[PDB]
Design a protein around this ligand. Sequence first.
Ligand code: HEC
Ligand code: HEC
Ligand code: HEC
Ligand code: HEC
Ligand SMILES: [Ca+2]
Length: 114
Amino acid sequence: PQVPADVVIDHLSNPNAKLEYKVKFSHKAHASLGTDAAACQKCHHKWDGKSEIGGCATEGCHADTTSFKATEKDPKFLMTAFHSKSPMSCQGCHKEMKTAKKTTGPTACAQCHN
Ligand code: HEC
Ligand code: HEC
Ligand code: HEC
Ligand code: HEC
Ligand SMILES: [Ca+2]
């Protein structure tokens, strides 16, 4: 399927405004992960490899936007999908790849959020 242009991820609206973030994400920058269907499945992990690809926060997925904890572990929350220790999350993949210092994205909170 079509690989999107750069976006700003902004699904969450932390009532503590100092901890509200709008986070740039580039499919193109992530091309080193691959461009085949399996590459897409490294993140779109429930995708069947054939259908339309959609967002992470639909019904039955990571739809709950009411936890604002970076340490959230319940997968029903969107925070978990971007932060958990799993290699499918933003923070989790970058940090797992950093285990033997493979080239990867930002691991620090502020460097990723900007
Ligand atoms: C290091 C420990 C942290 C901490 C404390 C937080 N983050 Fe992140 N973050 C990332 C993405 C893609 C989002 C989604 C933004 C959105 O959809 O609006 C967030 C969001 C947050 C929040 C909520 C922000 C809000 O607008 O409500 C909070 C409180 C938060 N984070 C804390 C992405 C990343 C990273 C990318 C690799 C990394 C690293 C971090 N976050 C790290 C941290
Ligand atoms: C492999 C080549 C692909 C393809 C074909 C797509 N992706 Fe991704 N993608 C990722 C994240 C976190 C999002 C949501 C960002 C947000 O919440 O704004 C997306 C989004 C998409 C879309 C749009 C879906 C929608 O309607 O919102 C599409 C069409 C899409 N992707 C296709 C994250 C990743 C990855 C993590 C690094 C990787 C790898 C891929 N995507 C790979 C692919
Ligand atoms: C969009 C690209 C994403 C991203 C970044 C993540 N998901 Fe999912 N996810 C879903 C379910 C039911 C689970 C639980 C495990 C399972 O039953 O397979 C998960 C798991 C995750 C994790 C791990 C969370 C943890 O630390 O335990 C992560 C980091 C993650 N996902 C990220 C459900 C769905 C979907 C339903 C079809 C869709 C679509 C997505 N997730 C999309 C994404
Ligand atoms: C969840 C939506 C995210 C977000 C917000 C980011 N990442 Fe990744 N990332 C991965 C790798 C291997 C790289 C290095 C690519 C390379 O240089 O070859 C990156 C890079 C980034 C960046 C930096 C982009 C740039 O312009 O240099 C940023 C801002 C970033 N990421 C944010 C690997 C992964 C994953 C492996 C499965 C996962 C999941 C994510 N990244 C998820 C996210
Ligand atoms: Ca936000």
